[PDB]
């Protein structure tokens, strides 16, 4: 990674671009609620998913953490947080597609994609793939 | 007109064996007059060759057994071809040997004198099917025909 430094917080107004549709994969996981999802949170779900169907299909990750996470070491007011303590996060607004699974049966996608939902700070939903494309 | 007690399935070499486990446990903790018991076994394997014969044993009320000898299991017949003594670790990616849907037939005829299956045509898929989920495929030519 590269970018530059520390970045302002900014708000999470309506989930406008906050969202998408299922790109790849048989199923996916969508955010019902806005939040900053941490790096750790992400990997938590990932490794969970794999661990569930050992030697399994393919897990996609449509979201990606690039916002620097500032934080102060238990002090007061000089300068801006050395930050980066949780490290980095991804801006997930209601609608966004976060993980795609493919190459597995429903009962596997449902379960795994659900277990992942337990690691995420948010209310979520698992989608088939209707057909709505473009 | 025959008192039985408990069925006990064992696989073994035909005309060759001893108490040795897991055979020891079975007829050991349930008794054995293997004097006259293994005397009917040697004649039931006198002119009979070696294999993995599944003799469907069945203890009697006198604590004996029904030693009905049967045709050695499908895995046995298949490795009679490839010259092995096992089966594939993972029936799918690996494939230890590749046989003929021809050889299956005459060895399957050896299996019908005990099997229930009516025709040898249905006994083609069974032996092929066993070879399927055991790490070995085949080749054929006639099959269906039809219009």
């Amino acid at each position: 990674r590269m970018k530059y430094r520390k970045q302002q917080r900014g708000r999470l107004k309506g989930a406008t671009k906050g969202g998408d549709y299922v790109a790849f994969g048989d199923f996916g996981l969508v955010a019902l609620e806005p939040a900053w999802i941490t790096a750790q949170q992400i990997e938590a779900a990932r490794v969970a998913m794999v661990r569930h169907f050992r030697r399994g299909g393919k897990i996609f990750i449509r979201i990606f953490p690039d916002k620097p996470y500032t934080k102060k070491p238990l002090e007061v007011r000089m300068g801006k947080g050395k930050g980066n303590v949780e490290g980095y996060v991804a801006v997930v607004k209601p609608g966004r597609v976060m993980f795609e699974v493919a190459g597995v049966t429903e009962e596997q996608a449902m379960e795994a994609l659900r277990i992942a939902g337990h690691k995420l700070p948010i209310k979520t939903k698992i989608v088939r793939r209707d057909a709505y494309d473009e | 007109m025959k008192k039985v007690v408990a069925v006990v399935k064992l696989q073994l070499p035909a005309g060759k064996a001893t108490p040795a486990p897991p055979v020891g446990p079975a007829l050991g903790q349930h008794g054995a007059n293997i004097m006259e018991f293994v005397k009917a076994f040697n004649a039931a394997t006198a002119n009979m060759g070696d294999a993995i014969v599944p003799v469907e044993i069945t203890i009697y009320a006198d604590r004996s057994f029904t030693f009905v000898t049967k045709t050695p299991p499908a895995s046995y017949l298949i490795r009679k071809a490839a010259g092995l003594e096992k089966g594939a670790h993972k029936p799918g990616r690996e494939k230890v040997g590749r046989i003929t849907w021809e050889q299956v037939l005459e060895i399957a005829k050896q299996k019908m004198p005990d099997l229930n299956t009516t025709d040898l045509e249905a006994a083609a898929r069974m032996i092929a099917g066993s070879a399927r989920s055991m790490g070995v495929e085949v080749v054929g030519a006639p099959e269906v025909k039809d219009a």
Binding site: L74 | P19, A20, P21, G24, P25, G28, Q29
Partner: protein
Amino acid sequence: NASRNAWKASGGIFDIPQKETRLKELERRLEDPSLWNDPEAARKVSQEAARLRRTVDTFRSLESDLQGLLELMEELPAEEREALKPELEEAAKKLDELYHQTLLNFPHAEKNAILTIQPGAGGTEACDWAEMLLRMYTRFAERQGFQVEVVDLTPGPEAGIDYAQILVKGENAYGLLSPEAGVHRLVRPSPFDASGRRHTSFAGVEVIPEVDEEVEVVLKPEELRIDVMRASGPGGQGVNTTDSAVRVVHLPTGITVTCQTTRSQIKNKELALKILKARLYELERKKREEELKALRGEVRPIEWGSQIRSYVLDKNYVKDHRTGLMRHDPENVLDGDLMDLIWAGLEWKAGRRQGTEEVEAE
């Protein structure tokens, strides 16, 4: 080769009668249901029952190979006698299986090892030998087909080596070098003596595998206990109503550190932890080396009363004292000819020693 054959037969033979009767006690044991209704019991039952796999095949296979050969072997330079000879060539790779089953049974035989040579009684001459054994064991490794990584070397005063250490890279490097510990006696006219008389000298040798670490795993919270409390001394009203004293006790060992230097409980807890670490680390570090002090216990004799195998260059003859075995080519021995020696003598003795001890009074 008729000699090493009967030898391998003799090894397998004493196994026969012992495991012969040992099997019969165990087999009629595995017959009863009452025996199996004791799960952990019939586990170790089926374990010894299992050992009868390696017992049977050796005796059976080897017994038939002795007799068949003996017959069609005695006399003929052309026909059926050379027909029977390469039938025992496969039986020679079956001798192979036998040997592998006698060595591989060490704790860490399979992995590379670490040899160390340290001179002893004999002075400047004693260390001259240390270097002779250095090259000796080194040279053997090349032929065994192994990579030698010299970890440390230190030339002495006159002759060159007060100490040395090596890393025999390969497999079974330990199991092979294992029976080479202890002292080594060396007699000869001394190349340093102005009179040249015979002088005994002694070098030391040791050998060991390799392993891992444990540090941070201990800092795991549920193990230690952290107390807070008011500080002591200066602070005024601050020190009074502000508890900044911290004490982390490491419950698993009871060892504890306490700190109340700064005014911050957080900066004090931070420090105590960072010191408990280092203390706890040394304790666990010692325990590691304390296990290697019980490996010094495995064998750690003095320096020249005791020996293991003599090498006299006068009358030309080496002599492993552990086995009574002999030889008359110390030159060859001091070069690599060890396989045959180590193999039988060393493995045999070492294994049979500890083995008969374990199955008879251990």
